[PDB]
Amino acid sequence: AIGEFMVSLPRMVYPQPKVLTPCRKDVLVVTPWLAPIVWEGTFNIDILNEQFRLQNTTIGLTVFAIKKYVAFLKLFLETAEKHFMVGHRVHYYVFTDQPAAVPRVTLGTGRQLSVLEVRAYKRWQDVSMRRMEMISDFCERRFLSEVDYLVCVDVDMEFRDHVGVEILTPLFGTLHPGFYGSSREAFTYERRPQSQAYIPKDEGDFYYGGAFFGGSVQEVQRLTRACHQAMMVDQANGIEAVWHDESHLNKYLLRHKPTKVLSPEYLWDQQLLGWPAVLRKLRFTAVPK
Amino acid sequence: AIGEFMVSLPRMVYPQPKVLTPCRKDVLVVTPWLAPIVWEGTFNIDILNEQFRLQNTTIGLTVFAIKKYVAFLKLFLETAEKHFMVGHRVHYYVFTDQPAAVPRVTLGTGRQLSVLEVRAYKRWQDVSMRRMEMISDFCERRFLSEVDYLVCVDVDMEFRDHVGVEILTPLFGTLHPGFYGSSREAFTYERRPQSQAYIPKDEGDFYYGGAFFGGSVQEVQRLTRACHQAMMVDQANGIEAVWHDESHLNKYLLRHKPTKVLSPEYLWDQQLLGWPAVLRKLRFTAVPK
Ligand SMILES: O=C(NC[C@H]1O[C@@H](n2ccc(=O)[nH]c2=O)[C@H](O)[C@@H]1O)c1cccc(CO[C@H]2O[C@H](CO)[C@H](O)[C@H](O)[C@H]2O)n1
Ligand SMILES: O=C(NC[C@H]1O[C@@H](n2ccc(=O)[nH]c2=O)[C@H](O)[C@@H]1O)c1cccc(CO[C@H]2O[C@H](CO)[C@H](O)[C@H](O)[C@H]2O)n1
Ligand SMILES: CCCCCCCCO[C@@H]1O[C@H](CO)[C@H](O)[C@H](O)[C@H]1O[C@@H]1O[C@@H](C)[C@@H](O)[C@@H](O)[C@@H]1O
Ligand SMILES: CCCCCCCCO[C@@H]1O[C@H](CO)[C@H](O)[C@H](O)[C@H]1O[C@@H]1O[C@@H](C)[C@@H](O)[C@@H](O)[C@@H]1O
Numbered sequence: 001a002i003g004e005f006m007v008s009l010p011r012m013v014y015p016q017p018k019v020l021t022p023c024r025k026d027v028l029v030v031t032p033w034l035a036p037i038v039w040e041g042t043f044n045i046d047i048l049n050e051q052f053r054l055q056n057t058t059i060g061l062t063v064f065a066i067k068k069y070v071a072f073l074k075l076f077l078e079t080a081e082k083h084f085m086v087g088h089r090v091h092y093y094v095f096t097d098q099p100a101a102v103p104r105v106t107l108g109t110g111r112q113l114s115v116l117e118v119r120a121y122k123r124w125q126d127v128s129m130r131r132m133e134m135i136s137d138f139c140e141r142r143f144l145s146e147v148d149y150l151v152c153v154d155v156d157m158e159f160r161d162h163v164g165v166e167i168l169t170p171l172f173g174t175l176h177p178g179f180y181g182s183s184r185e186a187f188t189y190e191r192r193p194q195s196q197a198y199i200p201k202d203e204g205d206f207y208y209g210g211a212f213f214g215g216s217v218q219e220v221q222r223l224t225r226a227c228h229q230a231m232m233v234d235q236a237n238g239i240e241a242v243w244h245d246e247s248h249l250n251k252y253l254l255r256h257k258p259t260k261v262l263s264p265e266y267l268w269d270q271q272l273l274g275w276p277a278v279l280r281k282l283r284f285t286a287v288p289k
Numbered sequence: 290a291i292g293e294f295m296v297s298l299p300r301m302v303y304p305q306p307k308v309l310t311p312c313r314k315d316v317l318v319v320t321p322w323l324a325p326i327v328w329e330g331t332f333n334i335d336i337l338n339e340q341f342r343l344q345n346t347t348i349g350l351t352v353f354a355i356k357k358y359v360a361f362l363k364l365f366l367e368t369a370e371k372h373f374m375v376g377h378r379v380h381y382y383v384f385t386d387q388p389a390a391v392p393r394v395t396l397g398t399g400r401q402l403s404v405l406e407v408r409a410y411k412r413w414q415d416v417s418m419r420r421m422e423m424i425s426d427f428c429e430r431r432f433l434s435e436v437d438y439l440v441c442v443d444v445d446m447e448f449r450d451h452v453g454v455e456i457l458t459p460l461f462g463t464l465h466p467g468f469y470g471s472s473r474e475a476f477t478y479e480r481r482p483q484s485q486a487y488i489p490k491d492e493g494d495f496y497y498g499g500a501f502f503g504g505s506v507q508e509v510q511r512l513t514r515a516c517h518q519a520m521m522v523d524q525a526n527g528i529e530a531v532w533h534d535e536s537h538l539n540k541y542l543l544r545h546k547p548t549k550v551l552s553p554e555y556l557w558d559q560q561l562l563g564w565p566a567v568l569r570k571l572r573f574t575a576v577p578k
């Protein structure tokens with residue numbers, strides 16, 4: 001549950017926070033609207049685990065496996081079992097056009113998986129974009145009654161390290177691994193004023209990755225429905241955003257600031273980008289071609 | 290209002306956040322439970338003002354002026370008018386045993402003041418401690434219906450610089466100016482196990498000042514009633530905490546982590562402590578003896 005009476009934390013022994021020592025000297029750890037930017041070294045996971053377990057938090061994880069992308073499910077789910085919200089209640093939601101192609105992955109206690117059959121679109125762009133509509137629709141069908149938070153990710157990925165309750169917040173986006181060091185003018189936002197996703201050269205905080213976002217069910221419903229409705233307007237006007245659902249996500253998060261931002265630890269491609277000094281952990285990474 | 294449907298921010302032009310540049314190199318700007326620690330340079334006030342104005346936020350400010358402390362009200366209120374939540378709806382609540390001694394201070398538009406008559410206790414310790422009971426009681430009498438957030442401060446103080454919506458959050462405490470650089474063993478927590486305020490030598494995050502705390506009305510009600518009930522248990526057991534209400538506040542905030550922590554910019558004494566390099570602004574300061 002969220003926003004419900006909270007019991008006291010028990011006695012815990014851990015290192016005292018150091019007021020006169022920055023937790024990172026190489027990166028920004030808070031946005032200008034006071035949202036934490038989540039990097040290794042910013043959080044004590046023992047404190048956070050206590051806070052979230054005392055609230056009996058349930059996390060939903062959505063993934064789309066349409067057409068040939070069913071092949072990615074086995075590694076995705078196996079690695080999620082090792083690294084994603086371990087110790088907490090988890091509900092996996094696999095959206096697919098092939099229910100029989102979902103692998104039988106052995107799950108830890110307190111973790112469950114539901115298969116949600118959906119239609120397949122012909123174009124990969126529409127498969128990607130229509131995730132917004134489908135996530136929004138299911139926020140009523142079951143998410144509101146079943147989970148506290150939703151995490152929405154790409155399937156062609158694997159967990160390599162801890163992804164836990166440090167990410168949970170009303171609304172989060174993730175720094176895109178290709179652009180975290182780029183100036184806003186270089187961001188690949190939609191730049192045509194005719195599109196609902198339009199962002200001018202002098203606006204923008206970050207370039208967020210379409211492959212990893214989430215928050216409370218209420219806030220994810222708002223985000224996904226807003227993006228879907230914006231994509232429908234674009235379609236009526238005969239325009240499709242340069243980076244599809246990701247362009248609209250970026251527009252939404254510019255106008256509705258996330259309450260946490262995840263570092264590129266949480267969305268990476270090692271083949272393409274290596275392992276820079278700024279990343280102490282690689283948590284969730286692209287599966288090589 | 291809090292937690293209500295939020296409209297989009299308008300287009301704004303401001304400097305892009307720098308992912309690879311820490312906003313401070315000399316201080317901790319986020320707690321290990323991912324609560325922002327509010328220092329100058331961590332926030333863009335233009336973004337925050339937009340977010341809070343769009344929600345039509347009302348802030349209550351409580352102050353106790355009992356017996357001779359009525360003399361501090363004129364400067365306190367005059368300086369609050371220059372520096373506290375300017376542009377937002379404010380409701381001052383002056384608790385006093387002398388309604389006729391409250392100075393007629395000229396208020397800006399959208400700002401109001403209510404005088405709340407209470408009893409005076411003989412001992413200064415009880416005057417200080419019984420603030421918890423009185424704040425808790427009034428959370429029902431009017432605060433729930435009148436304000437979104439409550440800020441609870443000492444009266445023998447003056448505003449010298451901006452104190453605004455950057456502090457607002459469900460629950461906040463403030464780093465005590467005498468101890469922000471101290472190790473936990475040196476903190477003047479209550480150390481007798483017989484007291485409800487007891488904290489062992491190996492526990493504690495920060496030493497919070499009793500002179501400046503707040504949050505949402507719901508969370509302030511919880512804090513103040515918990516501290517009052519704990520003080521009543523102590524009284525029944527013939528013990529009084531070393532630093533009175535401040536000892537209990539520290540116990541509560543250890544077990545219920547605040548969602549923001551304010552730097553000593555927000556609670557200072559220049560006569561006693563000077564003006565260190567770490568403080569870019571002195572916002573709220575003791576009135577010299
Ligand atoms: O991730 C993609 N789409 C977003 C998500 O949308 C879902 N999706 C998309 C299309 C689809 O047919 N089925 C499906 O389930 C699935 O969950 C995907 O993760 C996507 C779409 C087109 C191409 C690629 C991959 O393109 C490049 O990146 C890879 C990363 O290792 C490889 O380098 C690959 O060779 C390269 O083409 N991903
Ligand atoms: O602030 C105090 N109490 C907490 C609040 O409690 C309220 N209070 C307390 C007692 C009281 O009789 N009336 C009253 O309204 C008032 O709002 C106070 O701000 C307090 C209590 C005792 C002594 C002092 C001041 O002690 C020392 O600090 C001052 C800071 O400049 C001067 O240095 C002063 O000389 C020194 O004794 N403050
Ligand atoms: C100036 C430095 C230029 C170098 C930057 C290289 C990263 C580019 O990244 C692509 O960025 C696009 C937006 O502009 C889309 O988000 C696309 O999905 C993404 O490729 C995806 O994510 C990538 C990380 C890879 O895994 C790629 O294979 C994926 O298809
Ligand atoms: C090791 C360095 C030791 C040097 C530290 C000096 C600051 C001590 O501070 C006192 O701390 C107490 C708790 O231990 C109470 O909070 C007390 O109200 C406070 O004095 C108040 O606040 C102060 C800032 C002054 O304004 C003082 O006049 C007030 O009465």
Ligand SMILES: [Mn+2]
Binds near residue numbers: 154156
């Ligand atoms: Mn992909």
Ligand SMILES: [Mn+2]
Binds near residue numbers: 443445
């Ligand atoms: Mn005082």
